[PDB]
Amino acid sequence: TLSILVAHDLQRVIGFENQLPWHLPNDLKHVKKLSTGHTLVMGRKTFESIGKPLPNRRNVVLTSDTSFNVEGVDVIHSIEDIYQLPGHVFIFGGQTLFEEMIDKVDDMYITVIEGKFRGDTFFPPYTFEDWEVASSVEGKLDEKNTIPHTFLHLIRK
Ligand SMILES: NC(=O)C1=CN2[C@@H](CC1)O[C@H]1[C@H](O)[C@H](COP(=O)(O)OP(=O)(O)OC[C@H]3O[C@H](n4cnc5c(N)ncnc54)[C@H](OP(=O)(O)O)[C@@H]3O)O[C@@H]12
Ligand SMILES: CCc1nc(N)nc(N)c1C#C[C@H](C)c1cc(-c2ccncc2)ccc1OC
Incomplete structure (x- = not known):
């Protein structure tokens, strides 16, 4: 199973x-x-924008830099190595890789932030003619979650 995992605002x-x-x-x-x-x-x-691998899951970084090496990260050097990865694989970022992968993944778990932010990095355009909505769950606003958001799980038609 190959999925995208992204949060993007009203303009992606x-x-x-x-x-x-x-x-x-x-x-x-x-x-x-x-x-x-x-x-x-x-x-x-x-x-490198995150700065550290995330705990309790496998962390795979795609780069052409053959000296890249981080404690806790497995390196790949081509898109094609993604398909050799076992298990449930989430493409996590960024704009470039999403542009490389959005036409290949089985499904997408999108968090839609119901806001218009200033950005310099964008998710690819997509249309619901190609994606059925498996689920759409509103996030609860509160104390620390101040912006409306919505969890979409989209599956390719
Ligand atoms: N929520 C997110 O996902 C965010 C991601 N961001 C933000 C934080 C928010 O910081 C952004 C960077 O500006 C950056 C904007 O540029 P972008 O190119 O989209 O970032 P990528 O993660 O997609 O990194 C691209 C790099 O992996 C790349 N890569 C992509 N495809 C391939 C490939 N097919 N083969 C080998 N390397 C590849 C190659 O790595 P390298 O320069 O060290 O060789 C390329 O430069 O995105 C980071
Ligand atoms: C939490 C944000 C987020 N949500 C969803 N649903 N999908 C994603 N791909 C990302 C993301 C992201 C970027 C890479 C990011 C994550 C994190 C992060 C994610 C999870 N735990 C710790 C840090 C920190 C900084 C980051 O960019 C500056």
Whole structure:
């Protein structure tokens, strides 16, 4: 199983200056619950924007730099190595890799942030003619989750 895992705003912004534009602890829990015990694959820029591999799951970084080496990260050097990865594999970022993978993945777990942020990194355009909506769950607003958001699980038609 090969999935995308992304949070993007109303205009598909996912990042701004190496940072997430919004603070949404519920979506952090969503990511932990979905990806704990499985594989995250990310581009080099996405990985270095995080700075450390995420605990309790496999961390795979795609780069052409053959000296790249981090404690806790397995390196791949081509898209084609993604297909050799076992288990449930989530493509985690960034814009480039999503552009490389959005036409290949089985499904997408999207968190839609119901906001318009300033961004410099974008998720690819997609249309619901190609994706059926398996589930659509509103996030609960509260104390620390101040922005409306919605958990979509989209499956390719
Ligand atoms: N929520 C997110 O996902 C966010 C991600 N962001 C944000 C934080 C938000 O910080 C962004 C960086 O500006 C960056 C914007 O540039 P982007 O190219 O989209 O980032 P990628 O993670 O997709 O990294 C691309 C790198 O992996 C790359 N890569 C992509 N495809 C291949 C490939 N097919 N073969 C070998 N390497 C590849 C190659 O790595 P390298 O330069 O060290 O060789 C490439 O430069 O995205 C990071
Ligand atoms: C939590 C944000 C998020 N949600 C969903 N549903 N999918 C994603 N792919 C990302 C993401 C992201 C970027 C790579 C990112 C994650 C994290 C992060 C994610 C999970 N635990 C700790 C940090 C920190 C910084 C980051 O960019 C600056």
